[PDB]
Structure formats: structure tokens, C-alpha cells
Amino acid sequence: SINSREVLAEKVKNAVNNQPVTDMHTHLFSPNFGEILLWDIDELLTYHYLVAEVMRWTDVSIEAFWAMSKREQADLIWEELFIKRSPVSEACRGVLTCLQGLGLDPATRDLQVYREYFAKKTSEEQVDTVLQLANVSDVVMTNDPFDDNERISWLEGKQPDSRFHAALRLDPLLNEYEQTKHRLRDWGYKVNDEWNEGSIQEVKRFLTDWIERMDPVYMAVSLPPTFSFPEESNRGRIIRDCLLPVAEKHNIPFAMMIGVKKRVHPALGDAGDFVGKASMDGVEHLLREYPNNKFLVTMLSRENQHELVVLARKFSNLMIFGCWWFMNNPEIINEMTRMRMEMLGTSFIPQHSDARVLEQLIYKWHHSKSIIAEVLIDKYDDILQAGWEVTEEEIKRDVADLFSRNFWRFVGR
Amino acid sequence: SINSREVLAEKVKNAVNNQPVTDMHTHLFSPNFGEILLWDIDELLTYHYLVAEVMRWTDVSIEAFWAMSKREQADLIWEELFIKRSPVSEACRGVLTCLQGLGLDPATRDLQVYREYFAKKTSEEQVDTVLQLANVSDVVMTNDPFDDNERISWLEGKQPDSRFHAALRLDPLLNEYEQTKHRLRDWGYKVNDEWNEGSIQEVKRFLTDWIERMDPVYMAVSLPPTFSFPEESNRGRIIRDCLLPVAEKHNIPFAMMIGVKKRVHPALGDAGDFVGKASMDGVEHLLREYPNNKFLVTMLSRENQHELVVLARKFSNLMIFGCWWFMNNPEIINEMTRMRMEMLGTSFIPQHSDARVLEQLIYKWHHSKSIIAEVLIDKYDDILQAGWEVTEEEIKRDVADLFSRNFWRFVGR
Amino acid sequence: SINSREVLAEKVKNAVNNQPVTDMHTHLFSPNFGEILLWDIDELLTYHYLVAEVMRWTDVSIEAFWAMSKREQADLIWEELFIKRSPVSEACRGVLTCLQGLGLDPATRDLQVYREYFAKKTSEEQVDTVLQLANVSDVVMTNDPFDDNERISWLEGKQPDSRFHAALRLDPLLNEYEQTKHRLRDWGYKVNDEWNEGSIQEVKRFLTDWIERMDPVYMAVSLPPTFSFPEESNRGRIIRDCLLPVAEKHNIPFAMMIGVKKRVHPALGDAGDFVGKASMDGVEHLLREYPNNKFLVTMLSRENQHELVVLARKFSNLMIFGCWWFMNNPEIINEMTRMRMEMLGTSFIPQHSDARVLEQLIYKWHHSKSIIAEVLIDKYDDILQAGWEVTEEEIKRDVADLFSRNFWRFVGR
């Protein structure tokens, strides 16, 4: 029987370690989609989180950086972030965890040898390896139909294998309608100059067509700190007249990732986005006024985390998830997970990887599971000491909810 | 209900600490007996355990040491074992535990201040204080009629107060009969040169007379590693024809402390005794052949401990007790108590203090109770793990047995 | 590759728990042999280990005890060792582990209900249940052709099923030749009043006849602490001229369980045996002088354990096994298993149950595996900290050797 923090630590850690993970938000693709699925050590080293970091050290111009080959960029980052200074940051630590996880050894610092490992495998093979090592059963992708390369793959028949699920990303539609409406037109969607019946209907058609073609687990959009709702604006009207009605009809959750201020440093590309605290008014309104709609929410500002937890206490149609981007660091993951469990028990999704490069599934879940297990141990122990019987089966059940079931239960799959 | 090892631990520790102790073997005396009762920091520091230890470091010759005054010997020991080297030995640690328990501060290393504490009170006052701090309700003395000093107190009609009990110590009679018989004659005991009926009867009379004057809880003797029985020697015959039959008639247990090899280093005085493993044959014979006699046994050799425990499994007229002298060290107390509990459950007496100096009751019991508590927590945890539901009252009961009731139940008092 | 002590511990414990056990020494019999196979709660409670323990507490005379029915004895032991005092001894804890393993609940202390469970089952079923619960694949019995109740079955053709193996126990022959000599004649073995070629041939024929009837994995005998060899005694001659020769020929090992001092307390029956430290001279002689003979050895004295391990280091034809009887207590099992692994790696057999009652296989292996796993985790962790990388397969392999392969490999089966 589990009758001490010591036995508890053992059971919890084992349960967490053995629980297959459903990664509900990533930038990975089923291997049959091709090269869009990034992987290998050079890709890990050139992850944009690492581009931002190397630029704080190297004297090579950002322009010169983008001009180098992938291998050259990787060589530079390795030398600047791993050799010239100890790789202590979270993103650098992650690269090492991945290598060790693959059987490669960071002690040697033999980059050439690590590279040899990857050249000997196919995409299909590396996916099987990585999903096994990271114990991830399901991967949710981010499928942006506005990206020419992605759209053609879907239009030409590409479908993910059983382990990869789609999520319809709509940033261009919702945040750049003035420009995007012209593309909807090129694609046969007759949106008009004014927002009238015809425009509303065609935007719905667009959403419906893609829901049918992608069979997404949810519709998603990343939003700025200034997001508000209701709002007389293109975003405001599209959400109100098109997105919500359609999402309700197909019982598809609407995922909002709030807090990103795009391109504050355009030259850094993907590494050029910033963060800002958002008002909770828009979210509060959506939850209260659309009781039949489901919402998956994660926010970027550290200062929004606690009030977001309280908001989840108010609305059952709100399911909060992950420690997103700038929140995805040990110090923050820890405080967020503890505040969440303290006020929500197990009714939340603690994490997602946001993996852009296959191997990252290894370090993201490993780093995150160690922290989540420690939180669980403290919480199980507090009730154990209070006289509660905690069984191994109940721990497995709760751990299953957090890493996989709560999500599928929420999305209705 | 005790739902966790953590709660079990605190309940066990509380029970053990709160249980009044019957110390069944000491070298302390009821206060009304006089200066025979030793106490205070100078007495603590000149304990022969510390004398043997200081001679391993000091340049002072043993002759000179014995020549010094109490105070001077104590200053030498304090300086050599506490200041020049850290006082990490069990005996030195004990001195510090006593000091702290009395409210003094070891951190200052102010020996003069410590001495001032003791000069401020009377023997009766210190006895009340110490017995309170060490939570000792009953003390069993070692009463030797062959020691001129002690004998006079008894002949004077002095009686120990209710907190002190007598035990008739017989080493001289049993181990040095050839010399001792001449003293018995001087006392009116007409023992002959030949071991005839008259000699036997006079020796029994000597025993009966002191049993009447002291009303001892048991008769005792310390024996050498070569102890044997039956044996055609004064010791073997005195035990066979006098000691055992008298012990039976009075239903008084016979305590045998086996394993000491006396005076291997004469100049060290009380600090000059050694140890040796003994044969279990004599004890086995006594137990089997004298079923109506009760025996209290403790052995000096580490190598005799396990077989002594097995012998206890064989004979109910055998009660084993304590971790004697060279066995009275944490490492040994722990292995001994665990072997004993695993093969005897709670049917034994784990410890006695053997205190020669009053204050020692504090550390002797503090150090032992913590070890005994840890052993109990493990054993209790193991059966909680097996589904047994131990109650707090059952824990207090077992603790009372181990620290007090088992002894009184065995001596029939 | 295990990178953490947590993953190591999980894997080791899993390996240990799942590893089918080969119990190379018990006092159980294949169920087709009849009532000779003891089982059920009353048999557990009346195990002689508990008879010895209850006698240290109960007012009931040993005479009265033997006169009571099995149920009454069981009731008495339960009240005296489990109710009046916490059942903390190893043997008492063992009874509780057995009950819990069978799904019964120790918390209710309902002996009436526990008994009902066994009443509604057959020997065959319980054997299936227990061997399954205790994960024991093979059981080596102790087969004594001198016991009338057992011999009848062997003579009437009864053969144990494939899960039970035989061991030819020869105590009467080797230790009581003078009284056994006459039983051989009565069976057709013409041994003469003197040790001549005729006697040697008849004894050898006796061994050979039974080795033929039993096909035992080895021949065994328990010896006293005084055992020596060579020796001009019936035992010393039978071993030198008969046992060893027949052993080498059929290539079957000779198991010597040394250290038991028989019936030091006759009235206790099976609970009346004591222990003593033996000389190693005899075992050393046999190993050196009989290179072509296999010897399985276990010793009763705590004081023989370390030197026995060192002796195993000297001779490969020596296989030490288990923590026998009075050694079968956690404190000793732990020190023995650690000394053994430290000086012999995995080249030894850690444990055997010595079960006299069927269900004991549950607690004996549960209590023992628990300890062995801890030792393994510590030893594996030490090399891991040294840089060694152990695989789960190497662990399952090592665990296989300890609990089964080492034995079968030594016996040559």
C-alpha cells in the first residue's frame, strides 16, 4: 500500500513515466507529408528558440546568419551556446536531453558523430524511434491552409497516419482578413467588400470545407495582448458570425493562444515575436455567452496565468492547457502547474510540447514530466498525510487524465 | 487509524519518549546512601569509558593521571577528547547529551559554567531532576555486600527510597571464593575448608540473610568468556548447591552477565577489562536442567548475540536484556535490537543504562530510545504493509512491555 | 540504458517480481502425495517457529499445548502473539503477508472468516493458487526414505508432478547409523557390525536404489556445529566411502546444511533445535580433496556466514545457498546477501523458503525478494555511477541466475 511520500514518489514517477502522451499542440507533421516534418541534430540546433539565444552572443550579423547553410548555422550555435558558454538555458539543455535519449552521448561533444546517427535513418524510422522514446501515442499538428505548401498537400490528397491529428489554424483569416479576403476569393469563396450575408456564408463555407477535408480536433488561432470580444472588427465579426456557429454545429472546440505580439523584431523571423498581458474580458465573455461552444485556452504572459486558472473555476466550457512558449520554462511550468492543480484538481491539461522539430518530443515531455510528477507527489502526499487512501490504480487514472484523457474527453473524440 | 509511515513514526516516537523507564541494571544508588551516588560534570568526564579513550591520545602517564585530582582529570579529558579532537565517540557524545538535557549549552564549551550548575544543588535535587529528564521511574542498583562502604549503609538500616531497587551482586563469592570465604567466616558464616553440608548451608544462609535485608529483584554476577556449567569449582558448586536452590525458593531470577575478561590492563583500573566470546553450553544447561529457575542474561561479545537470541527462542525461563558495555554503541544496539525483535517479537528487554554517574541516565536512555524507536517504526510499518491495523494504544502497550513491564513480569514483582 | 536510479529501481523490482522462482529447499510435497503436504491458516499459525514464540508468553504448559487440538493451538497462538502483543516478529509478520496475499483482510482480525476460505478448497487448487501468487515455478522437496509416512508413497509408485523435485534427505543414515543400521538390514541391505567392503556396498546400494527411485536433484543432510571431516565415525566413513563416490558417479551435488544442535529442548519437538558456529576445516577439506564432487552449502550460525563466502571464492565446486532458519530474518538476510554479492557478484543462490506449510511460499518469497531487490538496486546503482550502462535484459538475466538458473546449472539438470 502507498503509505509514505517515499513510496508515493516511486509510484507517481513510474505512472507518469509510463503514461502514453497525447501531445495536443505541436508543429510536427505525419511523416508522409514529407520534408515539412523537420528532424535531426542540425534542425534541433537551429530551432528558433536557439536563434534568439545565439544572437545575444555572436558577432555575426543576423543577415549573415540567414545566409549560412543549415549546417553552418548549426555549427555556429553549437560553438556559441555549447562550447563558448555552458549550455545551461532550457532550450540548450533540451538539445542535450534529446541526444542522450537517442543513445548519443553529450559527454563527448562529438557533433560530427551525432550527425552520422541521423544520416542513417529515414523519416518514417526516426518517427517510430522518437514516439517510442518519448512515449507519445498521439500528435496534434498545426495545419495552416493559408500556407501554400501545406494547402496543396491537403488539396492533393495527403492525409496523416493514425498517430497524427489535424487542427485547423486560422491566424491569417482572423487577424489579417483585409489581406486574406482576396485569397478566399482566388479560391472560389465569394466574400464581398462589405460584411454581409454573402460574406458570412462564404467564410462559413470555407471553414466547413476545411473541417471536412482535415477532420480537425479543434480550430485554432494565436491572438495579441489586445484581443477583445465582442468587437466591431473583422476578427470580431468572423468569430461571432462564422467561427462560433460552425464550431458549435460540428461540436469542435475553439483554441485560443493569447498574448503574442507578432514581429517586434522582423529580422529575427520566427524568433521575432514578443509577449504582453491580455485582458480576460474577451475570454470571460466568450465563455459566458457561448455556453454551447467549447474553448481550449493557453496564454503567453506570466501575469495572466493565475486569473486564467480562476476563470476556469467559473466556466466548465473552458479547458486550459499547457505552459506555452515563453511560459515553457521550469520556473514557470512549476508555478503554473501548482496553481492549476490547487484550484482545479485534475481538470486541466498541464502541458503540450509545441515541437517544431521531431526529436524535441523527447526533451519537452521529459523535462515537463519530471516537474509534473514532483507536483503530483506533493499533492498526493498532502492528502495521504491527511488520512486519504491513494491507490496505484487511482494514480494511473489521474495521470492518464492529465496527459491524455482530459483532452480527448473535451474535444469529443 | 495510522495511514502513513510519517504519522506512525511520530506516534511511535511519542510513545517511546513518554513511557516511564524501569532501568533494570545500573551502578547508581538511592540518594540517602551518600557519596556512593556519583554525579555532576566532573564525574561524567572521569567515567572510565572516557579514561580508556583519553589514554589513547594523552602524553600524561596513567600513573600521573591517577595522581591528579578529579577536577584536573576532567580538564585533561575535556581538553584531549573534546577540544584537541572532535568528541564523536559514543561516550563523549553522551556527555554532551547530558549537558544539553540539563539546560546547559555545549556550544560555549564553558566547563566552568557547567560546573557552577551542579554546585548549586543537592543530591536529592539532582536525582529528582535527572529522573524527570530521563523519564526513569525505577532504578535497579548493583548492591555488593563485599564492598565495605556499601555494606555499612545496609547494616546501618538504611533503605533506598521507592524509586530504587536492590540487586544482590555476588562476584566475590562466586568468582573469588577462595579469598572470600575468609571474610564470610569473619561475618559468622562458618564455611569449612571442605565443601560439605555445613559449608553449603552457611553459604545459603549468607544469601538468605542478604535477600532479607535488601529484598533484591534478582541476584547477579558477571562471568568470564570461559564460564562453564556444570563445573567442579567453587563457582560451579556454589551455583549448583546454594545459589539456584535459594533463588528457586525465593523465586528470584539469577542474572548472568557473561563475557568480561577482568584486568587485562591492571593500571587502567575499572577501565582495564576486556571481552571474549563465550560458549553457550553452560547457559543452555542451566536453562534446561533448572526449569523452575528464572535467568536474566546479557553477553559482552558481539559474536554471542545472535545465538543468545536463538537460545531465548528455546527457553521461556530465559529473559535476555540490554546491550551491555562494549555492546552499548549505536551500531551494535541497532543490529542487536533488530535480531531480537525479528526472532522474539516483544518478549525481551532491549536496554539498561549501566549508569555509574547519575546524569548518564539522560544520554543512555536518549540515545537508546531513538534507536529502539526506529526499529519499532520499521517493524510496525512492515505489518501495516501486510494489512494489519496497529492502534496507538497497542503501540503504547508494546512500548510499556519493552521499557518496563517485561522486567517486572519476569522478576515476579 | 537506465539513466536514473528511479528507472533502475523500477526495472529491477519488476524483474525481481516477475522472475519465476526455483525454491531449491522446502518441506513441501507434490499434492498427489497426500496430507503430508501441510496447508491452511491453522497450519501457518502452528508452524514451529510460532510454537517457540508463543511459549515465551503463554501460561499454558507445553504439555497442555500438545494436548490441544490443532485449532485450539492455532487459537492460542493467535491470541498470545497477535492480539495480546503486536505481531511484529518475522514469523508472525509472515502469517499476515500470507493472509493478505490470498486476498483475506488482516485488518478485521477475523480468524473465523480466514478459516472458511481454506475449507472450501482442495490441496490441488491451493497449490495452484499459491504457486501462482508466489510466482514459484519449481519446488525442491526434502525426501526422507526413513519416514514411514513418506516412504509408503514412494513405494506405492507415487511420483511428484513436474513442479516438485526430490532431494534425498539422509540424516538418519549419516547421523544415526547405529540405530539406522538395523532398518537397512530389515529392508534387505546387508550391512555388517563392522565397516567392511560388504557394508560399504550395501549402503551404496541403498543410496543408488533411492537415487533411482527418486531421481533427486541432490542428496542432503543437516549437520551439527561439531561436524568435521575426515572423521573416523560412521558419518565420516559413510561420506568418504559411499556418499561421495555415488555422488560423483551420478554427478549429483551433496547439500550440507551445517550448524544445527538437535533437541536442546526435547519437549518443544521441532521447535527444540539450537545453533552453534562450525569449523570450516571440514568443508574446506571436502572441496579441495573432492574436485569432482559438487557441494551445496548453507550454514546456521551468523558467525560462519562471512568465512563461508570467502570459501566460495576459493572453490568453484562450492555453491552456497539461502539464509537458513535462524538466518532467515531481514537483518541477517540483508547483511548476508550484501556480503555475498560484494565478494561473489551473482555466483551464488540467495534464498530458499524452507516452507513447511504451503502458503508460506507467499511471505518467504515476498519478504525475501523485497530485500534482494534493494541490494540489487544498490549494486547496480554503484556501477551506474561508475559509468557502466546496464540494460533491462542484463538485469532480467542476472535476476534469472540468482533465483533459478544458478541452481539448475550447478545441479547439472
Ligand SMILES: O=C(O)[C@@H](O)C(O)[C@H](O)C(=O)O
Ligand atoms: O515555436 C513557437 O512556440 C512559436 O513560434 C509558435 O509556433 C506558437 O507556438 C504558435 O503556435 O503560434
Ligand SMILES: O=C(O)[C@@H](O)C(O)[C@H](O)C(=O)O
Ligand atoms: O561500567 C561498566 O559497565 C563496567 O565497568 C561494569 O560495571 C559492568 O557493567 C558490570 O556490571 O560488571
Ligand SMILES: O=C(O)[C@@H](O)C(O)[C@H](O)C(=O)O
Ligand atoms: O523448519 C526448519 O527450518 C527446520 O526445523 C528444519 O526443517 C531444517 O531447515 C532442516 O531442513 O534441517
Ligand SMILES: [Cl-]
Ligand atoms: Cl565467532
Ligand code: NA
Ligand atoms: Na516561486
Ligand code: NA
Ligand atoms: Na549491519
Ligand SMILES: [Zn+2]
Ligand atoms: Zn505552437
Ligand SMILES: [Zn+2]
Ligand atoms: Zn554494570
Ligand SMILES: [Zn+2]
Ligand atoms: Zn529445511
